[PDB]
Design a protein around this ligand. Sequence first.
Ligand SMILES: CC[C@H](C)[C@H](N)C(=O)O
Ligand SMILES: CC[C@H](C)[C@H](N)C(=O)O
Lengths: 245, 252
Amino acid sequence: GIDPFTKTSLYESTLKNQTDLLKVTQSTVEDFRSTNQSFTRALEKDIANLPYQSLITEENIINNVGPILKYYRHSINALNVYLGLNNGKVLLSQKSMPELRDDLDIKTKDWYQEALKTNDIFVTPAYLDTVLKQYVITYSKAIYKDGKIIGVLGVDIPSEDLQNLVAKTPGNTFLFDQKNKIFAATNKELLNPSIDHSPVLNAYKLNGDNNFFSYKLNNEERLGACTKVFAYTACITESADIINK
Amino acid sequence: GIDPFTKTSLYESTLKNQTDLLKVTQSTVEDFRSTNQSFTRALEKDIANLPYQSLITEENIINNVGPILKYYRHSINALNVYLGLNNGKVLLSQKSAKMPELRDDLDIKTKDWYQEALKTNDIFVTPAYLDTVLKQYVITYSKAIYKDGKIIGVLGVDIPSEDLQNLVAKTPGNTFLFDQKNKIFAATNKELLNPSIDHSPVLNAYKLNGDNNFFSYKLNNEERLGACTKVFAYTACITESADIINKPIYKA
Ligand SMILES: CC[C@H](C)[C@H](N)C(=O)O
Ligand SMILES: CC[C@H](C)[C@H](N)C(=O)O
């Protein structure tokens, strides 16, 4: 758009605009995670606050912890909320009275194993829930009372919840998961698994977090930026027509 | 005549972005409301799921409803979660350890959160007001609870209005909210909250223009551009200096 002064003004403007919108998508991901972490932490505290007598028999776990799992599940509309024990049983409150299940192979599960290896909440990649066969993100936390492990708390939130939040955001924003597979997008057509993303991904590796870049699609110029948000990569892209016309 | 800058692609995109940022603030308000409404509905359902016999004596209400109020309060970090009864007593869960107890001196039957809930099938959302007990500004979500068609009481959930302010403050853009009385309520630039700020120019211009339509206005002899929109009872606005919208080659 010929005069370099004018092109620079258009470029600097769209850079700021697109960076702002990328930040909104970043914030969406952050807020989803923190809300779920706060919820999980509160549940941990309510369980650990029970007297040991209420925690040390399986029947007492069912009768005393079960209602807490159920109310918490309902309060945020979680898919499953549960407490896994070292005997391999798990008290499960599932969307459909919490029951003690012995058939869920919990010690083979990352949500269980990993919670025992950190003092933080553990957040799983999205995976297909065994019980309800929906894709979930699990927040898990080893619960201790007086330094004594009670069990591992788990909270399953449908990954579609995050996908829907991201899709509603302004801008042509999208998320890749930890394996660089498309996870969420404002334009639902981007969900085609056969779409190649090397151009934006290569541009991102060259430029780094939040650094605006140009790239090509079918010999046409586009502009974009990406940034790491936990294990995700969040991106925004647009046509470069805004600066070239 | 017409400002030539308004015919530029730069101006057009600038307004498109301001519109996008205003919509982010609109979404913030909508999502805060929806989340709190859903929480309150879930709580109602769990209370009403108690057997009728558990809901009809004060002792049974304390013992059976109280734990539910507490666990729900913790789950979302609400300020107060409570069940108001027709006898005027209220089972109140708030920060203080012990189990929820009945308070008999909170004058509930003449309060809007109570009376409005009885007039509707819906959740009632109050304008922000100073909480009677903890003296923080709160928004209350209330709902009449029925069991087998019989009124048990009115559920209330108090969320500090500061929670919504904090959400708005984190949003991009110079966005802000007015309440139902056209008083400043939340702002990205927390200086806009100070009572000495004159919001008449933006409000007067908004009245002439309607939702999402950009307008010029002035404050303290500075030309500005703004747009506002209704979001439930609130008015959400975004404004910018005219000299940022159109950066002069020579500054004044
Ligand atoms: C109780 C564990 C639950 C079912 C978890 N989502 C899993 O699939 O392992
Ligand atoms: C139990 C009612 C509570 C305190 C409510 N926030 C009020 O001020 O009326």
